[PDB]
């Protein structure tokens, strides 16, 4: 019930690396997918108390759902992705070209509204295929590397029930109304004023805080470290700013 | 507030496939034909592995051919998943066999590139159109071959063959 004013998952779960981690989808509209493989990893590391911690595979999720999770690289939705996770399991999959996990990610990185050493993103795109085998040499097989959830669900439009879900079980995922003043967000608590809407993509919430008085939600984006504040950005906590509180989902992993 | 709420309540039951809470919510009158962001209905959710919920949802008048952000209808998803029984019930309640999407994807297109004879066959026996064109320039046959299912690649050509 009681809840601190500055709770941080990376802090209360220091033993869980995937939390601190930030990723890149590179020219895919994998809003949902990355936001999901992202919570289901810190959560797996948390539920087993860090006995197990793995990078769950964006790739896998992305390509092996089907019309039940949306249109691959053209959008998808968390409800089915998370219950897809509870209904069929996801495997291991670290960053692009990284040789980590049964299925490392297969869309190269790119640059999202930033100027920097990497190529400029191609604007949403082309679903990769779904091979149900791993990377040659990755030892435990696809059937053997699957990680299943025990159950999948939404939290209510209240903040208290969202803030509380992160406290007991780990960083959660959500979507929000996108605005162009949001691209270009660097620091401080974002708030919409001058922008056109541009879509609703998914993200990963992992705490909250009060800053300078303006209250806010600590989030991880899938646009990479040079974007935002290192990949991360605070947003307005309390008014359902930009629908950020309207759609929150999370599942508990399978004990064992 | 029960609009959006009951609607969500049914959406969660159908998605969790909680038949009894399905049974109640609709009888009391949850929308059934409710729609969240994205464009998903319960019948879309229930077209996973829940046949009574798919039955009851149609019997209270759920649009049997709602489409989403994407363009899929419950019949699409079912084809993808499999669930021969659900899809027979979808067709019989008036599913479009050629319900198309922003890609030009029909239940026949999805069913051979996710590997399932049984279902592609029913779609076929039920007026599935073979020749059609997914914009990527891929008929179910390319898809059939393209991915990994030569069986289905056969049945699709003999039918078009007599074409």
Residue of A67, A84, A150 to mutate, testing the B interface (most B Cβ within 10 Å of its Cβ):
A67
Tokens of A162: 């969202």
CB A40 within 8 A of CB A253: yes
Q: Are A152 and A88 in contact (CB under 8 A)?
A: no
Distance CA A36, CA A77 (A): 10
B138 Cα distance to chain centroid: 20
Is A45 noted as a catalytic residue in this protein?
no
Tally of CA atoms within 13 A in the half-sphere of A2 that contains its CB: 1
User: Using CA atoms, how far apart are residues A178 and A112, in angstroms rounded to an integer?
Assistant: 14
Which residues are CB-neighbours of B67 under 8 A, at least 6 positions away?
Answer: B39, B73, B99, B101
- Which tokens hold the place of B145? 């071959």
Q: Environment class of residue A133 by beta-carbon count within 10 Å: exposed (0-12), middle (13-18) or buried (19+)?
A: exposed
Contact (CB, 8 A) for A74 and A124: yes
Cα separation, A128 vs A124, whole angstroms? 12
Is there a contact between B84 and B75 (Cβ–Cβ < 8 Å)?
no
Listing from the earlier edge strand, what are the strands of the sheet with A248-253? A149-154, A248-253, A172-179, A197-211, A214-220, A232-236
In angstroms, rounded to a whole number, what is the distance separating the alpha carbons of residues B77 and B81? 6
Positive or negative torsion for Cα A118, A119, A120, A126? negative
Q: How far apart are CA A224 and CA A120, in angstroms?
A: 13
| C-beta separation of A155 from A251 below 8 A | no
Q: Do A66 and B69 lie within an 8 Å CB cutoff?
A: no
Residues 6+ apart with CB under 8 A from A5: A209, A210
Task: At A172, list the tokens.
Answer: 């959660």
| Exposure string for B26-57, b = 16+ CB within 10 A, e = fewer | beeebbbbbbbebebbbbbbbbbebbebbebb
- E strand or H helix that includes residue B125: helix B117-125
Q: Shortest CA distance to B52 belongs to which of B26, B72, B31?
A: B26
CA-CA-CA-CA torsion sign (A150, A177, A179, A76) = positive
Distances (CA, A) of B139 to A131, B81, B104, B113, B148: 21, 20, 9, 10, 15
**Interface probe with A: pick from B34, B37, B75, B102, most Cβ of A within 10 Å:** B37
Q: B39 near B47, Cβ under 8 Å?
A: no
Return d(Cα A69, Cα A166) in angstroms, integer.
24
Looking at A221, A224, A241, A242, which residue is catalytic? A221
Distance CA A168, CA A17 (A): 18
- Which residue of B45, B69, B103, B111 to mutate against A (max A Cβ within 10 Å)? B69
Interaxial angle between packed helices B74-81 and B84-92, expressed in degrees from 0 to 180 and rounded to the nearest 10 = 160
Contact by Cβ (8 Å): B66, B110: no
Dist. CA A10–CA A208, nearest whole Å: 12
Supply φ then ψ for residue A154, to 5 degrees.
Answer: -95, 155
In this complex, is the C-beta atom of B142 within 8 Å of any C-beta atom belonging to chain A? no
Strands (E), chain A: 149-154, 172-179, 197-211, 214-220, 232-236, 248-253
Q: Are the CB atoms for A11 and A209 separated by under 8 Å?
A: no
Instruction: Answer whether B76's CB lies under 8 Å from B103's CB.
Output: no
Cα dist. A104→A58, A60, A91, A99, B142 in Å?
8, 8, 9, 6, 28
d(CA A170, CA B158): 54
Question: Which residue, among B94, B151, B90, B160, has the nearest Cα to B124 in the 3D structure?
Answer: B160
Q: What is the resolution of this structure in A?
A: 2.8
> Cβ(A69)–Cβ(A86) under 8 Å?
no
Asked if the Cβ–Cβ distance from B48 to A200 is below 8 Å, we say no
Q: Count the domains in chain A.
A: 1
Distance (Å, whole) CA A203 – CA A231: 11
Please report residues of A whose CB lies closer than 8 A to that of B69: 70-71, 75
A130 to A32, A65, A72, A222, B22: CA distances (angstroms): 17, 9, 10, 21, 33
Measured between CA atoms, the residue of chain A closest to residue B114 is: A66
**Quick check: A114 and A75 in contact, CB under 8 A?**
no
- Looking at chain A, list the stretches that DSSP marks H as alpha helix, in order from N- to C-terminal side: 9-12, 17-20, 31-47, 58-64, 78-88, 142-145, 159-169
Which chain A residues are Cβ-neighbours of B37 within 8 angstroms? 175, 200, 246-247
Residue A170 tokens read as 């780990």
Q: What's the CA gap between B135 and B102, in Å, rounded?
A: 9
Could you tell me which chain A residue has the CA closest to the CA of B143?
Answer: A129
- For A2-35, letters b (16+ CB in 10 Å) and e give eeeeebbbbebbeebebbebbbbbbbbbbbbbbb
The CA-atom distances, in angstroms, between A58 and each of A63, A103, A248, B50, B111 are: 9, 8, 19, 27, 24
**Domain annotation for chain B: domains and CATH numbers:** 1-163 (1.25.40.20)
Q: What is the largest distance, in Å, between two alpha-carbon atoms of chain A?
A: 52
Rounded distance between C-alpha atoms, residue B68 and residue B36, angstroms: 10
What's the Cα-to-Cα distance from A9 to each of A2, A93, A234, rounded to whole Å? Answer: 16, 22, 14
User: Quick check: A133 contacting B, CB < 8 Å?
Assistant: no
Closest by alpha carbon to B122, among B53, B75, B67? B75
CATH number of the domain within which A220 lies? 3.90.70.10
Encoded tokens for A65 = 């759902």
Cβ pairs A/B, distance under 8 A: 53
HSE at residue B1, side-chain half, CA atoms within 13 A, is 2
Residue ranges making up the domain that contains A175:
1-256
Q: How many residues does chain A have?
A: 256
Q: How many CB atoms lie within 10 A of CB A140?
A: 12
A216 vs chain B: nearest CA distance in angstroms?
Answer: 24
Sequence-ordered list of residues with C-beta below 8 angstroms from that of A151, at least 6 positions apart, any chain: A86, A251, A252, B16
SS3 state at A206: strand
């Amino acid at each position: 019930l009681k809840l601190p004013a500055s709770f941080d998952a990376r802090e209360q779960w220091p033993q869980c690396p995937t939390i601190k981690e930030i990723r890149d989808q590179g020219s895919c509209g994998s809003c949902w997918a990355f936001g999901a493989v992202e919570a289901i990893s810190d959560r797996i590391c948390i539920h087993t108390n860090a006995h197990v911690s793995v990078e769950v595979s964006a790739e896998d999720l992305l390509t092996c759902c089907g019309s039940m999770c949306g249109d691959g690289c053209n959008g998808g939705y968390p409800a089915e992705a998370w219950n897809f996770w509870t209904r069929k399991g996801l495997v291991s999959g670290g960053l692009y070209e990284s040789h980590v996990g049964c299925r490392p990610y297969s869309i190269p990185p790119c640059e999202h509204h930033v100027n920097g050493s990497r190529p400029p993103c191609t604007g949403e795109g082309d679903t990769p295929k779904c091979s149900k085998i791993c990377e040659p040499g990755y030892s435990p097989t696809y059937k053997q590397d699957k990680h299943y959830g025990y159950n999948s669900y939404s939290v209510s439009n209240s903040e208290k029930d969202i803030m509380a879900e992160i406290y007991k079980n780990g960083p959660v995922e959500g979507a929000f109304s996108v605005y162009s003043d949001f691209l270009l967000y660097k620091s401080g608590v974002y708030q919409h004023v001058t922008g056109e809407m541009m879509g609703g993509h998914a993200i990963r919430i992992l705490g909250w805080g009060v800053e300078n008085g303006t209250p806010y939600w600590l989030v991880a984006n899938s646009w990479n470290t040079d974007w935002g504040d290192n990949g991360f950005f605070k947003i307005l906590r309390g008014q359902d700013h930009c629908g950020i509180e309207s759609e929150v989902v999370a599942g508990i992993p399978r004990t064992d | 507030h029960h609009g959006s709420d009951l609607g969500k309540k049914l959406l969660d039951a159908a998605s969790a496939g909680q038949d009894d809470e399905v049974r109640i919510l609709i009888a009391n009158g949850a929308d059934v034909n409710a729609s969240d962001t994205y464009g998903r209905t319960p019948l879309h959710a229930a077209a996973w592995g829940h046949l009574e919920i798919v039955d009851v949802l149609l019997a209270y008048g759920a649009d049997v051919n709602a489409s989403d952000k994407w363009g899929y209808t419950p019949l699409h998803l079912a084809a993808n998943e499999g669930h021969l029984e659900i899809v027979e019930v979808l067709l019989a309640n008036g599913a479009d066999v050629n319900a198309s999407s922003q890609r030009g994807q029909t239940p026949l297109h999805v069913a051979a590139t996710w590997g399932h004879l049984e279902i592609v066959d029913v779609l076929l026996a039920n007026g599935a159109d073979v020749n059609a064109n997914d914009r990527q320039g891929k008929t179910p046959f390319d898809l059939a071959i393209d991915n990994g299912n030569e069986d289905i690649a056969e049945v699709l050509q003999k039918a078009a063959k007599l074409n």
